[PDB]
Design a binder for this molecule. Structure first.
Ligand SMILES: [Ca+2]
Length: 297
């Protein structure tokens, strides 16, 4: 009965193209309705992003499954830490970073029912992959280059504090469908460039306060050029990821990341008191559900 709720949820997906049908992808699907995180399917501590963005990192102990939800709680980290669990002054907050074990999630549909923590740390649901090396020539010099991709289905935080009055871009960030795509590109000796694309065919960015209730945040990753975002089952907008470096920028599969983090643009990170209420300091995921398109007959 581990996949029944997800099968039933096909009702709510966008209509499959003619000739095709939505099919549960078991590998990235979880109702979290058991007594623990399924260690066959998930890494409680992501092996991919090992040290968080200071001053928060990620601990396995901050990830649990209880009463129908994946719970990623934000806590004071004590003692303070440097890199890789060592003592140091880099980290004083602990969040969670969950990664699917398998990393072959490609074209298809991905969605979570999430309630954000009432906290200035992120509640997120996204996919990513690792960098792949490609050799290039300039004249007559070989240059190593690397690329990877990253698909952000939702980023929010429950509380907004650092609002520049002159540029209040993040004023309503807890009420906007913040989704995104990144084609990461780097040449050896050069800087890592974050290559982004504008939203197209827009219906809405408008969303409900992320910490007040559970909402549905979903992506139809249609093909290598096209990703479409859904809030509470309604189409929001499209992003065509940038073709700067390749005609087919999203032609590589990904793993799922489920992450609780701290951002440099919100320096009023949770204090001890901010995090004293455990319910409030927790991001809740009722489920994660993934689908594949398959020909009907
Ligand atoms: Ca559940």
């Amino acid at each position: 009965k581990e996949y029944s709720l997800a099968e039933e949820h096909i009702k709510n997906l966008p209509e499959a193209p003619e000739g095709y049908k939505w099919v549960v992808n078991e590998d990235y699907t979880d109702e979290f309705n058991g007594k623990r995180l399924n260690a066959a399917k998930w890494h409680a501590k992501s092996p991919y992003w090992t040290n968080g963005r200071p001053p928060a990192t990620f601990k396995a102990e901050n990830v649990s499954v209880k009463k129908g939800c994946l719970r990623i709680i934000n806590t004071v980290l004590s003692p303070t830490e440097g890199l890789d669990g060592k003592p140091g002054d880099k980290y004083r907050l602990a969040g969670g970073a969950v990664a699917s074990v398998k990393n072959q999630a490609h074209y298809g549909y991905y969605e979570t029912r999430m309630k954000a923590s009432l906290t200035t740390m992120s509640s997120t649901f996204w996919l990513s992959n690792r960098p792949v090396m490609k050799e290039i020539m300039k004249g007559g010099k070989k240059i190593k280059t690397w690329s990877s991709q990253e698909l952000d289905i939702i980023e929010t935080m429950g509380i907004i504090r650092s609002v520049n009055p002159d540029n209040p871009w993040n004023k309503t960030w807890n009420m906007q469908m913040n989704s995104n795509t990144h084609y990461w590109y780097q040449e050896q000796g050069g800087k890592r460039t974050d290559n982004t694309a504008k939203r197209s065919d827009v219906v809405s960015y408008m969303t409900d306060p992320s910490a007040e209730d559970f909402h549905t945040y979903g992506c139809w990753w249609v093909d290598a050029n096209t990703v479409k975002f859904y809030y509470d089952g309604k189409y929001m907008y499209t992003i065509k990821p940038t073709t700067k470096y390749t005609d087919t920028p999203f032609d590589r599969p990904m793993f799922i990341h489920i992450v609780t983090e701290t951002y440099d643009w919100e320096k009023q990170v949770p204090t001890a008191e901010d995090l004293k209420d455990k319910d409030k300091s927790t991001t809740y995921y009722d489920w994660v559900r993934a689908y594949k398109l398959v020909p009907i007959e």
